[PDB]
Symmetry: D2
Subunit: 300 residues, 4 copies
């Protein structure tokens, strides 16, 4: 089976997970979700890297996913980060998300253990055969130590009907170009979304479908506009939007994400600037950089 | 406990599987092969032991069986780190309860902590456990590199941290990790995390290796270190050069895929792994056949 | 008007019996002019500038200029890692009647960013010929920072543009953006065939090409579709050309392209040491790709 | 055999003053090298700014070097370009001037194939009597000589005496030493990075062609000499003590920092030729501190 509502185009926000006094801060979370919804965002990715999946426990995951679904109420698909480096454990998280009523799962290539390409394929196949959710492959070699080859992504697209697309966070334009080209040749409706905000414009140019975004946490309307202008055939306006957002795109990565984005959302009054070890709050220099860029972007 | 402060070879031992379960009889044979050949420590449930796919119940069985066989002859150090500081503490406590002599704690992978984050991660754990802790740096797998200055800060401040397994292959890092850590604390241990860097890490002033190659060639890796420690640098270098083909072959695919194929060729285990890992290709198996034969191991 | 838009072909320097093959060469120039190429770059990397002596240089540049008869710009590779020698080469180009010079960042000696600025400044002030900065860190060991490129753009009016062969999309993006903010009319051409489409999307002006040696009409088309406002057709030309773009770099350029031009009957497959002719594997690949491509 | 030195070969700078060779300062430097026990001199290497020294100056610099040295140690002349034809010419010029050997860089910028590199050195080998030193420096050239390629060279071209290995990867260092000496037992492998010298010696190599020895000849000599004497701990201690200076000399592209340093020491004018320019104030201040710390100032 499969859930086609996961086949979104445009911006899917990899939303942070707000904490306060060491627990989930769902009141702040709800404000953030509504901020996304009110600003034209087309999907919500919960418990991705940006949402600190490594440090959110099982009971917290269920609470956060359920609350998200309640707020969203079917307006846009809700896609849940649910991948580890164990194929068995990954299936368990996928099934928990399915049980909760999620539309889809975002499933990272196993990190740290560096599986072969055939291993990656078998990993997704095992999951694909045991769920009715739409599955999004998540490639981010900088974090995981492994890169899904475009040919491997294409084989997945052809064989695993459950897998609806891929979040491509390898910043190499050769990879972006070939991932878009090969997967869509294998299956014409396979989606390819940028996993890098600053690659979005070029991934659209390559023939892709949008972005699963960090920037949209703080600037959803602008990221939406970037994509919307492109799809409208207004390449020049899309590029101008991309240009305008550049300072913010870079500033959100001067330290490991989500450290800067949480500092920025705290500056804007949405959340407490609290993360879980081994992550720690942004440096004073990062915070000063964000303050200036946000003010210059009219967000503060 | 100075027991964990081993010099020489600590074998990062594989976890044998058969028909989807732990193969503890094969594991016992491997452990005895290690003991018979003079290795100075065992590291259980490291990367080579497929820690990501071995469940909690299996971890208990595997660690208990190891201690039963080893019977206090050499330290048993248990891999017990995740990318969550809270969960890592839990794993370390379980390891303590099991009777581990120490823990090997990988830098959090995938979430790319800052240097202050790495420090705080080890400080949090170090202050809350009675066991010796070995920092494990392996940027190629984790996405993060512990700077030599950060390792030195850890050595100076965290008395519980007994040393570092340094698997960053850059000789500049190797040189500086050894130098800065031992300046911070004279008996801070530094072991190579790469078999083919062992010789140079020894030259840099380090203490040995936590090894993949010793799963199949324990005696030769022990000889490499022993020749060095006894003042015979050129003989150590010769041992190194003779092992180089085997050292290279064991990483032509992601470890432990080749080492399990090798141990299977040698009759020790079934060639079985857990997804997302899969058995070695025919090309890899053929290479191992040749290299193991040349080495006098087949 | 060295400010060309579209395709500027980095043409190979044909040899035969260890001497310049000026006969084969002229055919190739015509092959170029017939298919709407917008410029010619002579004695670039692809033209084996390192192994072509000064007399050959002169004979080659003059023969080129006579054939082109002013139809399109002739831009001559004239750069070494010595600022003083580079000037000598640039003045020579200027005297033979070149329209512009392609000046590679000093290779091998890894100058500082200030060093690169003073390098182009010194040359720029002692010539009245259009200058193209040429950045290709993979070969030279140095990368012109976009901010350095933009400082060149703003300060040195003689510097007309940059050939950007750093394949990193981040660099491509920033080079285009900063230099054009510094100076609206500053030109940025791709130095990698397989980056052309993206460089165009980035606001660039075309490509100084290797592939165009063998498929000039297609490269021109790739650009023309883009300039006309047909982004999708352009991307398709780009995808269709992908096999050939890759095949031409399976060994160090121009080893593959010369082999290809030989398959197509244009030149003899001869290079000068330390370059040697393509392997059999390379040749077989090229034969297949060229056929699939309709060029053989 | 005279060319087959062990220990320190100084890649000596080329001094300039008011735009011309400063042979008077150069002679002072050469004497500083000899006095401090250096085992060879490499002239017109990267450190000697070979790209910007004209043909006439090359001759004047080489001739003066041989006159001062008068056969005490091998004088090896940097004589390689990215053109095989031109390289042969420079090699012949060096040979006619009386150089004891030539240091021949892998062709830079045109990225030759492994076979091309082999044919490049074969072509030169068969056409001169001088000992040739292969110079591998991928960071500057864009090409890396494979250890297997260097071993083929060792086996085949009896005229090639050794290699200056400036690829800083310890794997490459290890395998270049290992494979070349297996091909030919007396093939020399010298480090082309000061901060790799200790490890290259441990690998079984033969010393270093050095930048640091320009300012600290005796210290670099001691590093190698302690190792060769079987004094591993002492060699390691020299290595550790030289770390600050080794790093400071490359905070900007060599020879920018080493010229600033020699100028601080009063040996030369701080003048380079474009596209090189003098060291920044930050670099100058670091060198001052590091040199005083090292007892060189």
């Amino acid at each position: 089976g499969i859930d086609p509502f996961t086949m979104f185009r445009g911006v899917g926000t990899a939303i942070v997970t707000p904490f306060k006094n060491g627990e989930l801060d769902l009141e702040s979370y709800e404000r953030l979700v509504r901020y996304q919804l009110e600003n034209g965002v087309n999907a919500l990715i919960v418990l991705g890297t940006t949402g600190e999946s490594p440090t959110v426990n099982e009971d917290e995951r269920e609470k956060l996913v359920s609350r998200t679904l309640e707020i969203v109420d079917g307006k846009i698909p809700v896609i849940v980060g649910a991948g580890t480096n164990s194929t068995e454990k990954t299936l368990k998280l996928v099934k928990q998300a399915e049980k909760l009523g999620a539309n889809g799962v975002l499933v990272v290539t196993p990190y740290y253990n560096k599986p072969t390409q055939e291993g990656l394929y078998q990993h997704y196949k095992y999951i694909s055969e045991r769920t009715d959710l739409g599955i999004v492959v998540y490639n981010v070699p900088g974090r995981t130590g492994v890169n899904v080859l475009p040919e491997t992504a294409a084989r997945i697209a052809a064989d695993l009907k459950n897998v609806v697309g891929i979040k491509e966070a390898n910043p190499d334009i050769d990879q972006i170009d070939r991932t878009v080209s090969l997967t869509k040749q294998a299956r014409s409706d396979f989606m390819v979304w940028s996993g890098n905000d600053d690659r979005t414009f070029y991934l659209l140019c390559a023939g892709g479908d949008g972005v699963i975004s960090v920037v949209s946490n703080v600037a959803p309307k602008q990221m939406v506009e970037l994509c919307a202008e492109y799809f409208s055939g207004n390449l020049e306006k899309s590029a101008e939007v991309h240009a305008k957002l550049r300072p913010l795109m870079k500033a959100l990565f001067v330290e490991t994400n989500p450290i800067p984005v949480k500092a920025a959302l705290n500056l804007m009054g949405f959340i407490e600037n609290e993360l879980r070890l081994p992550l720690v709050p942004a440096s004073e220099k990062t915070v000063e950089l964000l303050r200036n860029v946000l003010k210059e972007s009219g967000l503060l």
